[PDB]
């Protein structure tokens, strides 16, 4: 009985994807970039475990077989077993891992409500937790196209850091995958702020909104063709340089468009709520009041609102942001009472004119998570299976 | 004692204008089409009169003088009275009107909430009092250059029923003039129900709006070189042509890429807000259940939304708008007791199940304002001036 186990992150996209020019090969139609969130906050850990003829693929929460509890992953596995077949081909030492069926059993901390691709870190950490079992030799970079067939933007959830899919130009996509910017230490300092705000209406999927935006946006011609392409370097530059205010920016404009093409669309698609653009709103009250850029927000598929800043600049944002969501829970994990009357205090003490708190905004806010930039796929030695049997 | 009085409509912009690429000229981005409404609904009354001497351009409310109650007309003024001048200067026989000042007395009837461009209508109506008083030879589309140089698509409310605004190839703005594509008679049976939402926040205005669009938004690029020449073409045709499907379903997209533009701006202008994107919602939803386009929304810069139909399809229509806002005023004018009734029992008695009735909504509204395509400036015998001294 072989076993594995890992615990793999989420990512928050600046330069979004959306939209393939492939469905079967999920390719898209520009590169996008994410920022990996730290594991010790976020994750999700799968236990990989295979053995002499227990047998068909399996999933647990005690019960379910596997096919349609994705089905087009099936074709992922045979791909990794595949690899792991050319490896004891080549050593009849090697136990045949690859002829055996696969027990899965995975489980996440992502809070309810939050967005978090749930099922792009999913697959991640799947692909991760069978290429550690196998002890596949491919790089990182070749594996992630596994991931990306398997679910798209998962193959970003391999690196830690700053990543890139990069779209590639092949119609077989050898040449899309996911490669890394910068780790997390060459930029350790990016913390990130997640409001859940109260969805209080069903949003469209990714998957069926991205499809009917490629179909019908027309303005979604220029962002795939010039915008992004663009973008694309200015933010990578930015990022090896740890340049905020152009990361920022970059960010904020990219979030911006993509919404703006969801609107294009025809049905327009809605993500973002007035609780969303009320917090856009103070955030450009907030760069505005120190007279340099503080933070950056961005939005998915979704109202909720990320924000990028850096630790340096947390008390000047807090003071903001925490009095204008200091009743809504997630505050006390990482804060102090203290801690969090320091930052009341720095509002309180501040020449700050411009505006009047909005004590309402709040109540659409269920939520506040926070992080930071974090590292790739973490092996652990935890595990949700047992070595002997198989939980 | 000469005078002369005249009434101008309003119009709302189906393919939109926004955008100015000469701000000193008014020259646009791209050529917009609007819609003509009712004066027998909406209406601005200006009454001109200009005599032997009593001097210097005047308004009134019973007090102030001209220049920056404007102050970029005083040269439209005297582009008018220049017009005059090479009439008079033709025939002896004509009095100096272009020589003595003007007293000038203007009023509507524009419900305050509503949206309505009462700056264009104003110098519309201001412009056709004036060419009126001074008898013009000058065609109303070159007439209707002076209106644009004097506040942009107020050249289009100088045309009854379907007006184009030509962008124009020339840089002194000689071919960027309105254009009538059809006259309200090419097409009597288009209705439109403006629903008033109560805007609980302040708005970019127009001016500064557009121009941060210009100088910001990469999608707006897009926009001007291949959406809006591509959709002017196709929905002239649509309205030479009667095809109210077609004609709505560009007179929607085009809303949503004027917004989306907005978005795309930085930082990000929103108009709409979740009131709009439930009606926009509603009306596909109202669309859906009959299986055919009997409405079309669309939104300028604010959150009101302007309903465009088919008289024919009033009926079915109004047994949702009428379910879902019968306690907001507006209704009573154009329809009694009975009419309203008959709204609710048509709705009362369908098959509808796709969705349930918001009662909610409703709140957010503030008015109804029901009217229709109508003709262009109408010269009255009503006046605001006493024709003996001057009001």
Redesign the interface.
């Given at each position: 009985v072989y076993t594995a186990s890992v615990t793999a992150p989420v990512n928050i996209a600046t330069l979004k994807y959306w939209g393939k020019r492939d469905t079967k090969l999920n390719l898209p139609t520009n590169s996008s970039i994410s920022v990996t969130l730290s594991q010790d906050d976020l994750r999700t850990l799968t236990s990989a475990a295979t053995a002499p003829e227990f047998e068909r693929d399996t999933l647990w929460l005690n019960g379910e077989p596997h096919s349609i509890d994705n089905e087009r992953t099936q074709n992922c596995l045979r791909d990794l077993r595949q690899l792991r077949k050319e490896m004891e081909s080549k050593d009849a030492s090697l136990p045949t891992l690859s002829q055996w069926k696969l027990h899965i059993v995975s489980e996440n901390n992502f809070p309810t409500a939050a967005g978090l691709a749930s099922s792009a870190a999913g697959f991640a950490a799947l692909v991760s937790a069978i290429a550690k079992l196998y002890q596949l030799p491919q790089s990182t970079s070749e594996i992630s196209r596994i991931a990306r067939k398997g679910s798209g933007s998962a193959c970003r959830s391999l690196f830690g850091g700053y990543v890139a899919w990069e779209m590639g130009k092949a119609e077989d996509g050898h040449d899309s995958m996911a490669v890394q910017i910068a780790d997390s230490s060459d930029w350790p300092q990016m913390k990130a702020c997640v409001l859940v705000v109260s969805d209080i209406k069903k949003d469209v999927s990714s998957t069926q909104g991205m499809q009917l935006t490629v179909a019908t946006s027309?303005?979604f011609?220029?962002?795939i063709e010039?915008?992004v392409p663009k973008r694309f370097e200015v933010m990578r530059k930015a990022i090896v340089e740890k340049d905020f205010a152009t990361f920022a920016?970059e960010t904020?404009?990219d979030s911006?468009?993509f919404?703006?093409?969801c609107?294009?669309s025809?049905?327009?698609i809605?993500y973002m709520?007035?609780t969303s653009?009320r917090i856009?709103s103070w955030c450009?009250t907030i760069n505005q009041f120190y007279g340099e850029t503080i933070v950056a927000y961005t939005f998915d598929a979704g109202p909720n609102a990320v924000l990028y800043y850096l630790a340096e600049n947390e008390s000047k944002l807090f003071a903001f942001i925490y009095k204008l969501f200091g009743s809504v829970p997630g505050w006390d994990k990482k804060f102090t009472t203290e801690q969090l009357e320091a930052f009341n205090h720095q509002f309180e003490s501040s020449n700050f004119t411009a505006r009047e708190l909005d004590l309402e905004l709040q109540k659409d806010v269920a939520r506040v998570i926070l992080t930071q930039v974090g590292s790739g796929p973490q092996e652990t030695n935890e595990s949700l299976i047992d070595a002997k049997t198989g939980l």
């Open positions: 027309e303005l011609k220029e962002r010039h915008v920016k904020m404009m911006n468009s919404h703006a093409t609107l294009d025809f049905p327009p809605f709520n007035d653009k856009i450009h």
